[model samples]
Target chain A: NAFANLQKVGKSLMLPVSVLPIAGILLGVGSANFSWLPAVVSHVMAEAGGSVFANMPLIFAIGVALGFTNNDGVSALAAVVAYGIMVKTMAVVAPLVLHLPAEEIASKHLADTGVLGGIISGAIAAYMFNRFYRIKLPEYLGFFAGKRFVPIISGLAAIFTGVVLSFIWPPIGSAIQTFSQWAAYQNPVVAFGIYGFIERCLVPFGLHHIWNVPFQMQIGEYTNAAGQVFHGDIPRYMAGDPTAGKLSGGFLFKMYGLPAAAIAIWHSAKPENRAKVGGIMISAALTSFLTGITEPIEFSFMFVAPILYIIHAILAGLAFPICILLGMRDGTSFSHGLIDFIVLSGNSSKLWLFPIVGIGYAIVYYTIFRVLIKALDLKTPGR
Target chain B: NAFANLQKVGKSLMLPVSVLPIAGILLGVGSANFSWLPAVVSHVMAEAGGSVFANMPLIFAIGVALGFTNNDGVSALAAVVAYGIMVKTMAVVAPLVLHLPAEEIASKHLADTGVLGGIISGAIAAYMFNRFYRIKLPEYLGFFAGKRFVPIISGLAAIFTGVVLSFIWPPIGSAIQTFSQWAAYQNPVVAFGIYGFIERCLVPFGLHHIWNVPFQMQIGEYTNAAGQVFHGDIPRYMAGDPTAGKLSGGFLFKMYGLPAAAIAIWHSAKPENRAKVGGIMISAALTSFLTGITEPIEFSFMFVAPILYIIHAILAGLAFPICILLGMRDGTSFSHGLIDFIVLSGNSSKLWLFPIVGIGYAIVYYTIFRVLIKALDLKTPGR
Candidate 1:
């Protein structure tokens, strides 16, 4: 029963997750900082793409609500109201009652709460919908009593969720940093592997962004010829510092390896389901290769094929050391996709190693993923 | 065929419209500025309530999308994306392409675009969803090609919509005001009736907020005790100017009369539908009586029984003359709800005339509505 529900959740994720491809492509391609593209066109594309990323939590919430409520739009709208109320409660009530600083709830960075927040909101909206979509109320108050009552109840439920998140996240936030702080200071090869593995691990919880802050922003410091100081791999890499982008190993697995795994999944699919599975996997793979949005690929297999997911993460850790040895240090604005690889690899001394090392990662990932699936007869997408 | 579709749209509206009552109550009660309620609680309640109003277009879009798309959540999410893209396009492209000033599109007041934006978005999203929710694409691009392709198409559609609205609204905006300016300057009795009729008529398109600006904010001028001059009926009324609230006639119909129409609708309902229709009508009536949110009531009959709606508007115009004759002058923060009537009528010398005038308005509304629904056998809710 639990597995069935989890599978339903994964399947439900397909619709919302599907929107990420075009949005990611537009965002990454337009946001690539290329001077060749018309500024106005780029700006429009970026705006279109950024809008999706910005509203991801709400989108996720709506999708999950629909999934749970048999694809009902009322639940979707109720989820929207629920998300807003939840956000407001977290922003206002948390600061007042929990004594957390206002900055703790960045007005726009609610994406850090990510799919977890969305899932909770969607579930609550669905519950309210199922419970109250047909309820009758007092005659004088019947206006919003039934289907209308869903959003009201959902919003009211959000207040409690908001309060609960405050207590749950604040302390654990430090715990994330305290451990991340340790990982960042370790030997470069070890640190990179640990970072890669742990980052993938945290994504399901939507805390990857919070975990990313320390490594992506404050991991290391560099002083440049311009007499300016910068911290984090991304900033330092953009500043032409050679030592930045310690996390560049992401490019190998994201752009090549996982895509190969996508192929492996396609091959592993039941023969009857091959064509349909091919499309989904390939689209996800293409999105991953170009834009580094991995949820489609990651989430497709994360639940039904947990062992493959773990193996995928382990290979991610392994790729870091290989890239570090190849003297590859690159960064990207969005993610380590092919677009950013081209845009941000100006300082990479070992650019030639990309395809050479990339093939190795792809081969390893494909063989391992392919072997595990058959050995276990995993029920991935088609199968 | 179109009429049947219109009926579905109205039915779809029930879910989204239901949300208004609770949000209206929270907003009106919390926003009343009574000086006695706890500031923090009021602020929280107001925040919770305001969030819904702010996102009304998005909510309506989702609702309409669901109605059109068989209650699909993917379409709901697509509508959200479409709305965001449309808003951004209107904001950025319109100003750039049309030579309009930035203020023409207030960053936060996209509600000015209203439910018309929502309906278009919902329809477009539904179209995209129906068309592409099952599409097949090249294997490499297959992931988001099917159901996932819906939002991408909807977003692309929105860019065009954004451009279309830029050309559509700007010049016509002047048309709305040029006519409104004339009405504002007409004979007080005549102007009051016209304003009441026009305002109610505009509510269906969701542009009533825009129509409201001149009368609510810029209609009249008066100086307070401290000698600071204020324009608009609301500001002056807040400043205690006795002659403000030329639109005070809203209180009679909204607080006392419209609900009677609601009651009449119940009586008019087929005998079997009385209980169910009673809940809907009474709820809508209660919401209008309390907070002056009339969309639930107005939208209920706007299409299936549009004659009743027009009659309701006519009655609104009629009530203004009666109120002006009774020497009633009042104002409100949100609308002419019972809550606002109590809060803003302090300076009215004819406070004793409320129930008297209200009962007359109610009797007229009930008699006319009951007579029309029966004589015509209109397909109003239960019927």
Candidate 2:
């Protein structure tokens, strides 16, 4: 039942999730154009796009609210109010109950509660609204009699939940931190290979960023040319050092490896169906190649031939370590795409190595895909 | 058209505004019980209730989104995402555009944009959703083609709006600050009277808290018993200083004057209607007397008889100066309710004087209300 509920939750997320591609595109275009366009124009586009990325918690709050409530506006509003109350109360009460300084509470417990907290609050609010929206009150307290009582009750509920979260969140946060730190401390090849695998695996769940962003942008800190210290591999590399590309080796997979897979899928399609599938494949492939959006291509065959998808995931994971061993270093702002590859790695002496490696990746992907489709008689396009 | 739009906005606000009374009740009950209840119990209630108060901006964002879009969940979700994008983008871009350090941006322009920014963003999202929810995109960009595009487009719009707001917000913020400073600098009686008047006038608009809260709890700084320095009259008074009650004089009107007016309205009702209206009057009066929630009472006559409301506003305004002159100094956590009065001003030697002045205010309020209803043939209650 919980899994079914999760599926429903995922379906509800489509409304909010669909907007992300445009956000990625706008950000990719804007950030990539900083040199040619007026700084203000580029800044506006990048910041606008970045704003969407920055507010994942809020987006999820609203998304989950509407998603769970079957698109009820009142429930959605209640969700917002509930989420606001829960997070804020948690922020205040966690420090007090946990006996920690206010400043330390964020690092200790509150940070993990962002998108997750929103989901919890939204679900609670929706439940409260469904249960109480029709309840009547006595004549005396009639003003807060019906649907209006939902928010009032939600506030009280959030307070108790906040108290509970205060006790539990710190340990959970610490556990996650421990795991992440442990992984980072492993052998570089193993760490990155696992990281790449998990990142790809979690893409379907849309939770890869929960780990990827920190490792890519926030794990190691470096000072930028503007005398500002920054975190994450991309910013560090963009600040002029290719040495910052440790976590960024996945770009090789995103930019070149994914596109190669798309081509293989295209070639393996039945001869008669190739033309029909060409539009879907080529467009998806180009989207990945040019802008680094892979969902279109990934979703095309992921559910149809899950085994191939799994294979793709594993290969995607190995690409990280392979790129590292091959001494390929690059960075990107939005993702591993042609746009960011050119913009971020423009000055690197080793840039030429990407195309050479990409060609090899393409041939290997085509051969393997062709052989698999023929051997398994997989129900791919036209087959 | 603009006026009609304003009316719609006002009507749209009723859902969110309706919840404030219960917020006041929860906060009042929670804080008042701090002494008798377990410390944890009271802290939980207070913090939980405080969370609702703290997130006014978010509440308005969701409220306005729902309100403007006629309860469409998609629009509401879009509104929330849009609001999130707007505020975050503004936070990031304001400094870069205004040539200010990061720390200073919050104090300058960004702070003013909180609730207003939410409202603006909500409205814009609703508009965008209305305009573009049905649009189709090419097959490649089809994922972001329809309802999905709502949040994406909203982000771009928010960025431009944020840019405009950054330029305008600072001057507006400075003006308001200057005015507030000027008022506080005036003679104490004049300042308090003006504060009381404006607070009353803004009641229908529900913005009285913008000034009322600061003067009550956040204006003049004082260190509490726990050694935490706080600003605001009530907090300062709660820390054991009646001298902090300068701006709190309006409680005399809420507790005594409003109840007296309710009684007068009850008496003036037609004998046939008195019984029907009695329930309304008594409940409203009790709410104000016990919890200082005057909306029910105020709203009853506010629209029905505008002149009487205006007189009440003036009287409410003068209560501050009158209380100050009468040497009645006290503060409350909630409002002018008996609960807050007893809890906050309990140990004051001059607490007895509150009843003395209150009795006089009540008599004056009753006599004036009675006379006005009879002479003007105002349709108060029995009339």
Interface RMSD of each: 3.5, 4.2
Predicted structure with the largest TM-score when compared to the true one: 1
lDDT per residue, candidate 2, B266-311, as tens digits?
Answer: 8888868887777667766777888787866776666556788788
List of chain A TM-scores, every candidate: 0.60, 0.71
CAPRI-style grade of the A/B interface in model 1: acceptable
Q: DockQ values for all predictions?
A: 0.39, 0.39
- Top candidate, metric DockQ: 2
Error of 1 at B76 (Å): 1.0
- Judging by lDDT against the true structure, name the best candidate: 1
Second chain alone, TM-score for each candidate: 0.92, 0.77
Give the C-alpha miss distance for residue B185 in model 1, angstroms.
4.2
**lDDT by residue (tens digit), candidate 1, B299-334:** 777898888888888888887887788777777776
lDDT of 1 at B99: 57
TM of each candidate vs. truth = 0.79, 0.78
DockQ (0 to 1) for model 2: 0.39
Q: Kindly provide the TM-score of model 1 when superposed on the true structure, using C-alpha atoms.
A: 0.79
